[PDB]
């Protein structure tokens, strides 16, 4: 299917934060986020995917890294640092 990266990340982040913050589902949080990070990995193919990448690309990649660190450390503090960056990009997408 065809979806704007702007829209994909908006609904994706809303879903992930509901699962983590609302339902205490960290496993489910990883389920929804990983696909969206995988899409970014193949890279922008349109002008709108390119501009989104230029604006929000560094922040999302850094957030993925804090998620990655959580995975090794067990430090809930690392997950909150990821969500600080996710919140930041979200409120600019809106």
């Amino acid at each position: 299917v065809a979806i704007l990266w702007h829209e994909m990340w908006h609904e994706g982040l809303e879903e992930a934060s509901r699962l983590y913050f609302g339902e205490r589902n960290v496993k489910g949080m990883f389920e929804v986020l990983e696909p969206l990070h995988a899409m970014m990995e193949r890279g922008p193919q349109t002008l709108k995917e390119t501009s989104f990448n230029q604006a929000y690309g560094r922040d999302l990649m850094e957030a993925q890294e804090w998620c990655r660190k959580y995975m090794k450390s067990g430090n809930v503090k690392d997950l909150t640092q990821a969500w600080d960056l996710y919140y930041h990009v979200f409120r600019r997408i809106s």
Partner: protein
């Protein structure tokens, strides 16, 4: 429920409506004064839309009865906050929370 104790008075007439965006500064702490989060440490205010379940019930009901400019002390029962589960690694089970929150403006 939630108890609201005034630290500094607001204008007494400009209250938030459901669907309005409340801009606040907050410092949150466990009932023994241990701080867990503060927007003032970040120098940037916190925004949330009232009556949308974006935030815990204690905030929804506590902030609703504040008027612009007012700095209040919200004492929130675990029932109006994170309950028996709490928030793993951050907020313990059955925790009463205390927020110092100032309603800066409405949008």
């Amino acid at each position: 429920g939630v108890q609201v104790e005034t630290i500094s008075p607001g204008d007494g007439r400009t209250f938030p409506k459901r669907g309005q965006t409340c801009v606040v500064h907050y410092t949150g702490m466990l009932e023994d004064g241990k701080k867990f989060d503060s927007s003032r440490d970040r120098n940037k205010p916190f925004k949330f839309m009232l009556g949308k379940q974006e935030v815990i019930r204690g905030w929804e009901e506590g902030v609703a009865q504040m008027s612009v400019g007012q700095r209040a002390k919200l004492t929130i029962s675990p029932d109006y906050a994170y309950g028996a589960t709490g928030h793993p690694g951050i907020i313990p089970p059955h925790a009463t929370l205390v927020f110092d929150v100032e309603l800066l403006k409405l949008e």
